[PDB]
Design a protein around this ligand. Structure first.
Ligand SMILES: *[C@@H]1O[C@H](CO)[C@@H](O[C@@H]2O[C@H](CO)[C@@H](O)[C@H](O)[C@H]2NC(C)=O)[C@H](O)[C@H]1NC(C)=O
Ligand SMILES: *[C@@H]1O[C@H](CO)[C@@H](O)[C@H](O)[C@H]1NC(C)=O
Lengths: 49, 49, 77
């Protein structure tokens, strides 16, 4: 649900403290919409895709 | 040598350091050094002696 | 998910701590002129030329984190 608050604990060596966050939601329509992200790489390996 | 890789650290049930969480990369040589077994999977502690 | 054969009874055998014996000095600093532990360029190569390159490398001559393993306790066979 919207306004949800989440949290978790942290190990002592990483500086202590508790990690906290808040989340929000968007409802569905009849048809589902999604997001795509394209990134291409040139010199990592042999040019082969 | 056999390696463990992870982004989350912690202490064990008796507080001993070495406990990790969530997905973890495990490297294990085997086959008298001929094989290089590896997996990015979930490790779960055992509750025995 | 993948195929993994399952384990047996969960009595883990006894484990010691003898790091005092493990404390031995075999320091081997790395020699860049000897060119050991030197990454290659990821996708290209050259031949018979000197070239400056920016990337990932170790410092010259570090003592590092030399650890070892050894056999356990044994009484004959
Ligand atoms: C690699 O390149 C070097 C120089 O860039 C070449 O070395 C020269 O070789 C000639 C012929 O043997 C000599 O007359 C020069 O004095 C050398 N120059 C030096 C040593 O600076 C070398 O021959 C090349 N290697 C190959 C296989 O062609
Ligand atoms: C060895 O382990 C892998 C991964 O758990 C498994 O896929 C394979 O079947 C095992 N082989 C034998 C002989 O148990």
């Amino acid at each position: 649900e919207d306004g949800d608050y989440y949290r978790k604990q942290l190990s002592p060596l990483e500086g202590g403290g508790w990690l906290v966050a808040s989340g929000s939601t968007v409802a569905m329509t009849e048809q589902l919409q999604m997001g795509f992200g394209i990134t291409v790489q040139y010199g990592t390996d042999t040019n082969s895709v | 040598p056999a390696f463990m890789l992870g982004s989350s650290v912690g202490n064990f049930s008796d507080g001993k350091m070495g406990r990790f969480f969530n997905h973890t990369l495990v490297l294990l040589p085997d086959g008298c050094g001929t094989l290089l077994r590896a997996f990015y999977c979930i490790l779960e502690p055992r509750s025995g002696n | 998910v993948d195929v993994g054969p399952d384990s047996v009874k969960s009595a883990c055998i006894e484990v010691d701590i003898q790091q005092t014996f493990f404390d031995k000095t075999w320091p081997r600093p790395i020699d860049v002129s000897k060119a050991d532990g030197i990454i290659y360029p990821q996708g290209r190569t050259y031949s018979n030329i000197t070239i400056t390159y920016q990337g990932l490398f170790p410092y010259q001559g570090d003592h590092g984190d030399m650890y070892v393993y050894s056999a356990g306790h044994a009484t004959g066979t």
